[PDB]
Amino acid sequence: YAEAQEQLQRVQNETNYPFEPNNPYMYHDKPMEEGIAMLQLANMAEAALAFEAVCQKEPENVEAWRRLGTTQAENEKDCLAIIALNHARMLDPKDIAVHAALAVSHTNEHNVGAALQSLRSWLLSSEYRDCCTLLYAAVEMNPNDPQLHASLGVLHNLSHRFDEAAKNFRRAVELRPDDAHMWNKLGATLANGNRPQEALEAYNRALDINPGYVRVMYNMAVSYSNMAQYPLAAKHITRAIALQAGGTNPQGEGSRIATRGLWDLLRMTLNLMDR
Amino acid sequence: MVNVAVIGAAGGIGQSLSLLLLRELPFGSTLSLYDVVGAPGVAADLSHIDRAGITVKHAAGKLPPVPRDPALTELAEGVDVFVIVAGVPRKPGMTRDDLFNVNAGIVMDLVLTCASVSPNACFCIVTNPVNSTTPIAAQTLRKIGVYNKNKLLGVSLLDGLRATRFINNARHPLVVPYVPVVGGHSDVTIVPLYSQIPGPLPDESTLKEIRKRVQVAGTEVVKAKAGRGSATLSMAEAGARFTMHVVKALMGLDTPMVYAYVDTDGEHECPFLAMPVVLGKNGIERRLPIGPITTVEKEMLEEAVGVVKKNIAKGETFARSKL
Amino acid sequence: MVNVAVIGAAGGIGQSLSLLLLRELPFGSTLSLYDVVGAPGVAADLSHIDRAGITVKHAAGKLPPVPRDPALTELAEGVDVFVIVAGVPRKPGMTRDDLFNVNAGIVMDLVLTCASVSPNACFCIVTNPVNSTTPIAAQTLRKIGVYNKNKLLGVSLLDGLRATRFINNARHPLVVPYVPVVGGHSDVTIVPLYSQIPGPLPDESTLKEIRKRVQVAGTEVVKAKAGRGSATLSMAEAGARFTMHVVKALMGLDTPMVYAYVDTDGEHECPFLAMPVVLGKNGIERRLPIGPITTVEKEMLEEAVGVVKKNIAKGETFARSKL
Amino acid sequence: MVNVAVIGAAGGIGQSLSLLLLRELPFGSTLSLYDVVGAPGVAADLSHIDRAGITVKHAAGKLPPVPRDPALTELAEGVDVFVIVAGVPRKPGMTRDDLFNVNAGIVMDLVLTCASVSPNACFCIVTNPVNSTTPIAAQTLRKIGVYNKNKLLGVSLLDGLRATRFINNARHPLVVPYVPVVGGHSDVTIVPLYSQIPGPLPDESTLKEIRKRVQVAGTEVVKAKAGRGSATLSMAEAGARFTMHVVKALMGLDTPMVYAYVDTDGEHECPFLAMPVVLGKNGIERRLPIGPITTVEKEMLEEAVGVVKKNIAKGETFARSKL
Amino acid sequence: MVNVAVIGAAGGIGQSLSLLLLRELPFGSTLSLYDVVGAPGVAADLSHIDRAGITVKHAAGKLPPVPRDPALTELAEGVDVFVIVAGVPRKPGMTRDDLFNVNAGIVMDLVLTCASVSPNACFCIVTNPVNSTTPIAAQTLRKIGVYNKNKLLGVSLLDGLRATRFINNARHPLVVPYVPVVGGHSDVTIVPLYSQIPGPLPDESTLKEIRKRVQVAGTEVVKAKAGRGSATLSMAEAGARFTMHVVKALMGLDTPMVYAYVDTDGEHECPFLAMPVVLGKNGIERRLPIGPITTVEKEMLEEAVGVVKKNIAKGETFARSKL
Secondary structure: OOOOOOOOHHHHHOOOOOOOOOOOOHHHOOOHHHHHHHOOOOOOOOHHHHHHHHHHHOOOOOHHHHHHHHHHHHHHHHHHHHHHHHHHHHHHHOOOHHHHHHHHHHOOOOOOHHHHHHHHHHOOOOHHHHHHHHHHHHHHHHEEEHHHHHHHHHHHOOOOOOOHHHHHHHHHHHHHHOOOHHHHHHHHHOOOOOOOOOOOOHHHHHHHHHHHHHEEEEEEEEEEHOHHHHHHHHHHHHHHHHHHOOOHOOOHOOOOOOOOOHHHHHHHHHHHHOO | EEEEEEEEOOOOOOHHHHHHHHHHOOOOEEEEEEEEOOHHHHHHHHOOOOOOOOEEEOOOOOOEEEOOOOHHHOOOOOEEEEOOOOOOOOOOOOOOOHHHHHHHHHHHHHHHHHOOOOOOOOOEEOOOOOOOHHHHHHHHHHOOOOOOOHEEEEHHHHHHHHHHHHHHHHHOOOOOOOOOOEOOOOOOOEEEEOOOOOOOOOOOOOHHHHHHHOOHHHHHHHHHHOOOOOOOHHHHHHHHHHHHHHHHHHHHHOOOOEOOOOOOOOOOOOOOOOOOEEEEOOOEEOOOOOOOOOOHHHHHHHHHHHHHHHHHHHHOOOOOOOO | OOOOOEOOOOOOOHHHHHHHHHHOOOOEEEEEEEOOOOOHHHHHHOOOOOOOEEEEEEEEEEOOOOOHHHHHHHHEEEEEEEEEEEOOOOOOOOOOHHHHHHHHHHHHHHHHHHHHOOOOOOOOOOOHHHHHHHHHHHHHHHHHHHOOOOOOEEEOOOOHHHHHHHHHHHHOOOOOOOOOEEOOOEEEEOEOOOOOOOOOOOOOOHHHHHHHHHHHHHHHHHHOOOOOOOOOHHHHHHHHHHHHHHHHHHOOOOOOOOEEOOOOOOOOOOOOOOEEEEEEOOOOEEEEOOOOOOOHHHHHHHHHHHHHHHHHHHHHHHHHHOO | OOOEEEEEEOOOOHHHHHHHHHHHOOOEEEEEEEEOHHHHHHOOOOOOOOOOEEEEEEEEEEOOOOOOOOHHHOOOOOEEEEEEOOOOOOOOOOOOOOHHHHHHHHHHHHHHHHHHHOOOEEEOOOOOOOHHHHHHHHHHHHOOOOOOOOEEEEHHHHHHHHHHHHHHHHOOOHHHHHOOOEEEEEEOOOEEEEEHHOOOOHHHHHHHHHHHHHHOOOOOHHHHHHOOOOOOOOHHHHHHHHHHHHHHHHHHHOOOOEEEOOOOOOOOOOOEEEOOEEEEOOOOOEEEEOOOOOOOOHHHHHHHHHHHHHHHHHHHHHHHOOO | OEEEEEEEEHHHHHOOOOHHHHHHOOOEOEEEEOOOOOHHHHHHHHHHOOOOOEEEEEOOOOOOOOOHHHHHHHHHHOOOOOEOOOOOOOHHHHHHHHHHHHHHHHHHHHHHHHHHOOOOOOEEOOOOOOOOOOOHHHHHHHHHHOOOOOOOOOOOOOHHHHHHHHHHEEEEEEEOOOOOOEEOOOOOOEEHHHHHOOOOOOOOOHHHHHHHHHHHHHHHHHHHHHOOOOHHHHHHHHHHHHHHHHHHHOOOOOOOEEEEEEOOOOOOOOOOEEEEEEEOOOEEEEEOOOOOOOOOOOHHHHHHHHHHHHHHHHHHHHHOOOO
């Protein structure tokens, strides 16, 4: 290494986002092309590693920060996010993607709080009453707009409004039936509303866009565990654990406190199975 | 000695229960209050009472809720008894499917925050879906790795209070203190036991009416209040009495017998039922059998068992879609 | 046999008062309720608590409030004690003139309607502007023509509660059950008596600080609750105890000595003032002298006398405007 | 207002009974002690107690106990409850049934003297035997022409207290308030009803041993006292508790359920039995049936009736010899 | 949990004190009884009232009194409160000088064997010569080596129960809970502070008559009893109440202000006097100054302190003599 030495605590002094070891990607020649190409033709686990490798070189890579947060959301890892997206927002506050992708990360942890502020910042680029007011905005203007029309469901989900969120997704789903993300939302509202059987089929089809969306199959496991067949949940969470990480010599594990979430489900499953 | 913390003492089942506990709590015992809004206004109100030997502590919180509020992590140090009373009211709203989810999203956090700093502490659930929300608390406790079946109770004394009020009016040459009640806390689940009380009983044509009125009780109160609230005054009285019973048992000045809603522990299947137990220094001590049952109550008991089985299953798996 | 009837038992103050009353009344008593809104809902909720002998009765008024409501005259038959709690919250300021005027009108209407049916009853006014509402009730009773100076008791006990709490906090571990307080109930019109208690009083500057705190503790509560609401739980404790004292004095089970806002006949120059009295079977039976005091308290007493003179002067100043 | 009087308050029972009764009488009550010797001393002892609202009045009545003592006639002018306690020590050097002959005349003349002027007063019999002197008192009352089966009670609470304590020691830490005991109040005439209380009972042999232990109860104390006196620290407690129950029922503050040796009034084959009754403002109100009886307990409540029939016959044939 | 032991619970006053004690002890107690003659009889007479949660222990006597009884030591195990009530009737036979020699020698033997097994325990002396027996107890404790000044009290409440009863009988509707009485317990060593109570005190002649009455009222009982006995019932409640305070101050649930014949560490020059104190968990916490005294009472206080000087001098003269 000679001079490649540390740089880790050097970039960590301000960015608390851990970089972890076992990231050989970082020095082949320039990992950006393989990192970006891995999304289309492969999984989405080592892609985050490549994004981290290209990001650690300098903090001015806006693309690296805006993509690392999005990548560390699919592979169930919504604790390594938030801070990275905030740092990306610090670099540019007019950016559209960082604000849009920062709301999906503050609603999993049930933070509420800054999620409404991020939605307002995205749109411009009682707290709830004010946020919902400005949100209406293009109630009709730019109707064919996918992002604006889909944001209504995200607004409804943070107020336990799973009734109209699915309704606006249904129009948003058919507008651009290509990306899996919009389809996953379509599933979630249904699951989170005494309606499991009406979404699982989408969970299967969503997989044909990119077989790896850990979130869809995790929700599959949750829904079937809530829908009788108490086993099966195990025979999906076990492969969830495997595909989640660990294919590159446990990825240089380090802390992996967040991963606990997944592992937890296994228990609640086994137990209800008397095991 | 003895620290009691009411969690959510800023509503109608809040401040009133706190006031009732203030004037009956034993000398030399503190009292803690927490709520996202209105807690300082109650602390500044309960500190102007001439009761001696009682000190009041209070904490507030940010109006936008945040998981693991720092104030609770500090106030929950040294607490001996927790009364989880917060949550949305029993407002009709929409069907039960959403209210249960809303309250599950609250109990999961308000148990996780409290149990981390003070593990050995009795818990009293006085929220909504008490057939669905107690297993949620049990699951939340099991996760962190600490769980004692002898220190988790569901306050279902309101049904007993209602039951020992209608038999004292129709049959009013006599007065009886209490009547056994089994089952759970729901509409078709509560089963009064009128065959275990002294004195002759009226004809069967009236006993069934009394049992039906005991089951369908809160709906008449809701109708009497149109839609602008529910019954809170008569529910804070039962919670205060149960908390006093638990405090006396913990101190060592009584070993009372209470019914509550506790774990069966492999005795009657359906492992969350309302059966009589005896308290003690270390929580539950002995779980007593139901006793002789009239042949007309067995059908009600089996229907209640089935309904509670379904409710237990539905509540012990409240998860989330993440998204 | 008593028939304590509470008027206005639906607001912030009164909901707790009814609950506190219907857990200590003697066996065979009878409660009553009345309000424009929420009275049926309070009655249907309080009737589910097991208390043998206690019977609950209620009535509701019309939304367009008509003076001399027929529903109230039906509840005024065979009543022993009337307690007035009705009022219009506090509002975020809005000057005291309009709030005082509406409170005076409500008190006039309620007192006239209640006293037009059962004359030989007891009135235990609780409304916040005591110093001017009590002479209003006296004037209305004289206008009716059944005025008795021994049955009219404006409740003034929260001052005693605050003074006792402060003394017990600042002189640990000495405990004194009660502390005499004279004057009216407002701002500077209060004059506590600290030289008539057994013990080595701490100092002079600290004692003056305690006097200032007990004088201005009213604004502290409303400042703690942002800018909305008032002291509700604390004020509900000072009414139930006074009502119990009056009830047990009438029933012949006790002859207590208290401090209350009364209709002093002679002795002190003030037409109305709060001085110690003793309650017998027919209300006040003997009026005790104030007793020896200190000059520093004498100046405060003189200032309080002046303020009391002004307040009651104005009280019958605007009351004559009705005629 | 009551004027409870203790007849014979100078022996080993009256002295403690008066002290226990004075501390719990309500406000505005009155006591009345009477005895042939020692009454002024007991009146002087109890006149130095700081209780407020209690008035003590006494009278002593000549040596050579005269027939119809003029002094006792004066202390009978408004008494509402009579507690007959004046008996005689057994002279522990003497034994056999030479106690019935001497106490019968004392009971007769005391009851006649008390009832000759205050017919409307409840009579409580404490002297032994109770089941042989209660018919004597009934005959004496019937002789003078005034009688009331409601206002004639025989104290038997001692057996219930003894049985309640004996079962709490064998079911710790589970406690019960009371245990039903019926039959009589002498040796083999008492039967405890252990199959009418909540909780899992122990095996049969222990139950039989406990049942026998309650029967042989009045002789173990004598053996422990080495033939010098009988138990007197529990009879006073039982009498005080029964008198408190009767007074509270008479004043109207309670409607208790008790077990008293009374006339069955055609509800049983025996003319006198210890049936469970409920008191009230005019004495006995209802006579509850005994209820379900265990098969093993049937023979006991068939020997008890047989022996009590002979006891009542022996006690009632004595009245014809006198008068 | 506490352990109250009564020494000499077989005389006229010991039995009533024990009966009154086993009705107010907190749930969980180990009340003990001991006497040379009559111990088992009274022991197996209180173990029949239910009073669940109390265990009764006792010891057995021996031959004519032997110093350092082996049975007393066995019962002298871990015990918090020791009540010394054994002694000899005071007034029967007169002989004031002789009777001291009779009683003191008993105490000199009781304290020595009772201590040295429970050094950290209270001592509530109840014997009649209170003025000249507490110094004897203090001298005995000094010889052993443990003389905790805050854990040695001499009961005296009796002479206040008398003052309160006498005063309330004059001023009629007015009642004062307690009245301060200082000095000692002898005929001329008692002075009541009637200028420290609130109210219109009567004339000076009546006050002097009342002061004289409380100094002579201890002979009225003897004169009414014809010299056969003395005051037993009235003294049986003064002690059994006062001891309760100690428990409520030692178990940690109260902090009351009491008057007792205590050791004056500083303050007055007299080594022992009856001055107000504040009890606590460890014993005596604060010793308040006597306070303002009018001109008339100063001479009485001076005479009382002069007499108690000689009384204490005599008290610490038999202890020096020993044999």
